[PDB]
Paper text:
During replication, structural proteins are translated as a polyprotein precursor P1, which folds and is then cleaved by the viral 3C protease to form a protomer structural unit of VP0, VP1 and VP3. It is assumed that five copies of this protomer self-assemble into 12S pentameric units, which then further assemble around the genome to form the full icosahedral capsid. Compared to those from other species that have been studied, many cattle antibodies have very long CDR-H3's (third heavy-chain complementary-determining region), including a minority that is ultralong (up to 71 residues).
The recombinant Fab fragment of Ab117 was produced by transient expression in Expi293 cells, and a structure of the complex of Fab117-SAT2/ZIM-S2093Y VLP-derived pentamer was determined by single-particle cryo-EM. Density was sufficient to confidently model a pentamer of SAT2 and the distal part of the ultralong CDR-H3 of Fab 117. Only the knob and hairpin bearing the tryptophan residue are visible in the density; beyond this, the density rapidly fades away, although diffuse density in the 2D class averages suggests that the body of the Fab is positioned away from the pentamer and thus less constrained to C5 symmetry. Fab117 binds the internal surface of the SAT2 12S-dissociated pentamer at the quasi-threefold of the icosahedral protomer with W138 buried in a deep pocket, so that all the interactions between Fab117 and the pentamer lie within a protomeric subunit. Four disulphide bonds, between residues 109 and 131, 115 and 147, 119 and 130 and 125 and 146, stabilize the knob in a 1–6, 2–8, 3–5 and 4–7 configuration, and this sub-domain has a further extended hairpin loop of 12 residues projecting further outwards from the body of the Fab, at the tip of which is a tryptophan residue W138.
Author numbering:
A (entry chain 2), G (entry chain C): 30 to 44, 55 to 85, 101 to 170, 174 to 190, 196 to 209
B (entry chain A), H (entry chain E): 106 to 149
C (entry chain 1), E (entry chain B): 26 to 132, 163 to 201
D (entry chain D), F (entry chain H): 1 to 127, 134 to 221
The structure:
């Protein structure tokens, strides 16, 4: 639980940016009928800017499951066995019993210093099917930083 | 003793948007490659 | 200390990329996706290197044009290397206009992602070598064979 | 005024891994800089240590708790060629290296309801009985899902040789690499839960001899 | 001071080991048991060296795979050396997982006791050279000829 | 800007004993260590000096005391090609070397009953009479099996040339290498006994010019 | 006479291990009918451990002979003339008039640092036939060290 | 004079299992290759 800064600079954290705009959107209905690997990919944007996404879910003490929320840079496609290595990307876990809310911030990334071109894609995967003992909804809050 | 949760260590400079006077945050490497996670400030 | 997993050590190898070609772009994605160099290159979003091109086969000389130069059938006074013992090895600088090259692109890769163009007197077999290779943003890597 | 030399036989052929450099064409190029770029990694295994990747338990990364009395949720080898590790980044990286040595870290995450607390023990069985009492004399560790739903189980390197072979053929051999297994000590199971398992390279793991598999 | 009977001096020689083979393991027990190098090696229980391989014959190029690599009919981008004047000399580093190799084993020697695998384009004559040999636990040595 | 050279004729051929090294393939390998290993020997003759090996007296290493009056038990040459030395480590090591020079140490061990004490003299007869009186003017020594049942008889190098030839053909030549013989001074023989004889290289022995015997 | 430490380290003796278990077994009847070369090979064991064997014989003042007791590492086979060079291995001599008892200790030896594989084999050879003026028996005491 | 039997010299460190206070034993290089034999302690 906390705030994840993907591809962070080691020197910059030795002992600035901020979110300018805001947005909200529902992604999918988290239900037990979706097994592992139920990907939901959202390209960003839906100016040399870094993104800041706060994916949240509505879960109670009787809800169980796990979502993997990551930001893949230039996700053209995902192969059959590639999902298992998604943790290679700036990612977080949403668990109803641990944090039930994700927050990832990534810098500008590209071949050039100015972008047009979906550089980043927010990917949400259902790592484990939803378990209960009454529906769970996922809402994504996306805000550009340092435009 | 350091006032950070389990698995969190100090010595990480707080990034903009945390309001920590000492500029020391409970940093934690994880979440990908090169990712750094901050959860709160560091108090000594 | 681990040495054989260093990127600058692994990528510093001549990999066979294409066989029996006379004129070809130097797109580093021409490498085989199952070889060591190609597989570890495709496991990174971005990269940068200075290339070495080796042409093996019966050929007299090889012309090389930097990235952005116009494509013409006949090359005159362009960078030309004569073959010695049917081998032509030469180091190509990073001529792309971009700061870094990318294996993937969420737009097929545009034509600007190459190290130039190469023409040969007769068809040759080509080997690529990444000198001082730098890789960025690691990507999923899967076992090529079971 | 002429240096006498002698062109030896045997040297001079085109080697694909020779240390010698070539003659540049445009020798006065100066690319600006790449210092402030993000995500650079100069060592493959450094990526594998900080990026745990999930396991393949019959197409899924999690393990379902069983109501029947067996006390063994899973029993998988520690071989990179095993179908369990097939999808991991380490196995993908191990396919291109002949030999390896070092330790593995296995990460376990519990994704059940917060009300249900379960206690699990992880046992390593060096090259075999499948009981906690016999695993007491062997390497073992126990973690309760009431303090941290995240457990790391370092697997020591106990192979006979200094280095092991990345490529081999052992489906369920008793001496494969140590038979990591997960035991649930609580027989008072309430309902169905899940345990996500992922593996990351240890701080001392080291691959060697890069190989191009043409199998 | 005795020099010509030093282990690091005697074993530092090219010994003919096998003739007219295109693909062969680099086991050090292929040496003739009556030769100087092949008989003093068998007078030791364990040993360690950085082998040098020389191939003589009409061959374009030769390959070499490190110990433990899978055996395949075709080799792509594996360590390859081209012949110069029909001679291919290349230094093979010690590759076996074990700390020391053994001439004998009370358990035939298992396949892990070799310096790799070598495949040639055409059959060649092979010579082995033990660089920096280190013998252990001397064993009985008998006169080869009377 | 080009260094002028000249490829000489005669050099460059493939020598099987050339001092030059080759170009490594994997030049960044580092084998851990062999310092704490046991039994390493860096010199072959050091092994031969510290490891005496038995002689071949018609298939047996010992000598049977004779009841008849001859005062001689054995009379063997000091040649590595002789059938007596055929089974020794020195002869096996001498087969691969063209020349040698130095001294030999002959070890005699008495393996009889403790009650029976006998006195033996060992004589070296340089290149020949077989009597102790004639051996008095020659090199000889005497040891009694009542103090130590272990005797060392150093054989000096008295060959005419500085170095001798390891390979030769002299069955019982009077000038082979010195005709080491063993004499028993006590004619009061009681019963049958044995004398184990072994040879080890002297501290000054030195082989040279390694060769491959293709005889 | 004494204790022999085969393949000992020179530095270790410049100015630890001990026997854990114990065992005894009769090997053969030392009789005059056996000429030179009557080998008796005992594989060990009959864990990275060094061995410690005390071969003893029952001989009186009227008994005469000699036995060569050695520990050959990885003794696959012994050739026809290979017996004469058996002294190249850690060995001791058993003489009825000198010591009538042997004791050899050897360290762990192998390609790897952990063993399964008969690394060591106790070989007893009749150097000289037994002589008398009433049978001689040989008993071997074997004990692992530093298991 | 050194108190060792014939052919035995001091200067050899006693190994475990002899109980010599001075850590000097009547060593003797013999028994094979690299073999070192100890028979008793050394007294000066």
């Amino acid at each position: 639980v906390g705030i994840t800064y993907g591809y962070a600079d080691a020197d910059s954290f030795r002992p600035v940016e901020q979110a300018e705009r805001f947005f909200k959107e529902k992604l999918f209905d988290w239900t037990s009928d979706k097994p592992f690997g139920t990907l939901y990919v959202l390209e960003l944007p839906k100016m040399r800017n870094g993104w800041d996404v706060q994916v949240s879910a509505t879960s109670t003490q009787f809800n169980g499951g796990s979502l993997l929320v990551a930001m893949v840079p230039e996700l053209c496609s995902l192969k059959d066995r590639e999902e298992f290595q998604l943790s290679l990307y700036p990612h977080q876990f949403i668990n109803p019993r641990t944090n039930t809310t994700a927050h990832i911030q990534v810098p500008y990334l590209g071949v050039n210093r100015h972008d047009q071109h979906q550089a980043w894609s927010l990917v949400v995967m259902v790592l484990t099917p939803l378990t209960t003992e009454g529906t769970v909804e996922v809402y994504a809050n996306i805000a550009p930083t340092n435009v | 003793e350091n006032n950070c949760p389990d698995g969190y260590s100090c010595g990480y400079r707080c990034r903009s948007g945390w309001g920590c006077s000492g500029d020391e945050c409970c940093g934690r490497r994880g979440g990908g490659w090169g990712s750094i996670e901050l959860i709160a400030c560091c108090s000594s | 200390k681990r040495v054989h997993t260093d990127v600058a050590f692994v990528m510093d190898r001549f990999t066979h990329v294409l066989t029996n070609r006379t004129a070809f772009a130097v797109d580093l994605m021409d490498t085989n996706e199952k070889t060591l160099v190609g597989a570890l290159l495709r496991a990174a979003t971005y990269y940068f290197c200075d290339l070495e091109i080796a042409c093996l086969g019966e050929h007299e000389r090889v012309w090389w044009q930097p990235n952005g130069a116009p494509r013409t059938t006949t090359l005159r006074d362009n960078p030309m290397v004569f073959s010695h013992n049917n081998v032509t090895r030469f180091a190509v600088p990073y001529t792309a206009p971009h700061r870094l090259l990318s294996t993937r692109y969420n737009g097929k890769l545009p034509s600007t992602f190459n190290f130039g163009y190469v023409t040969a007197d007769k068809p040759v077999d080509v080997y690529y070598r990444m000198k001082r290779a730098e890789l960025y943003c690691p990507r999923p890597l899967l076992p090529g064979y079971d | 005024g002429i240096i006498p030399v002698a062109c030896f036989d045997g040297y001079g052929g085109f080697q694909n891994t020779d240390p010698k450099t070539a003659d540049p064409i445009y020798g006065y190029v100066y690319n600006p800089s790449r210092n402030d770029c993000h995500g650079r990694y100069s060592n493959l295994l450094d990526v594998a240590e900080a990026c745990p990747t999930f396991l393949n338990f019959d197409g899924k990364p999690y393990v379902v708790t069983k109501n029947n009395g067996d006390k063994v949720m899973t029993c998988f080898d520690v071989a990179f060629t095993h179908k369990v590790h097939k999808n991991t980044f380490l196995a993908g990286l191990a396919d291109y290296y002949a030999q390896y040595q070092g330790s593995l870290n296995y990460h376990f995450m519990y994704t059940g309801p917060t009300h249900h607390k379960a206690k699990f023990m992880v046992a390593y069985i060096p090259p075999l009985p499948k009981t906690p009492e016999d695993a007491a004399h062997c390497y073992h560790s126990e973690w309760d899902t009431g303090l941290n739903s995240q457990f790391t189980f370092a697997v020591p390197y106990v192979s006979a040789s200094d280095f092991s072979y990345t490529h081999t053929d052992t489906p369920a051999m008793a001496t494969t690499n140590g038979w990591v297994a997960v035991f649930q000590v609580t027989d008072t199971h309430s309902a169905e839960a899940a345990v996500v398992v992922s593996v990351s390279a240890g701080p001392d793991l080291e691959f060697r001899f890069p190989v191009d598999p043409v199998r």
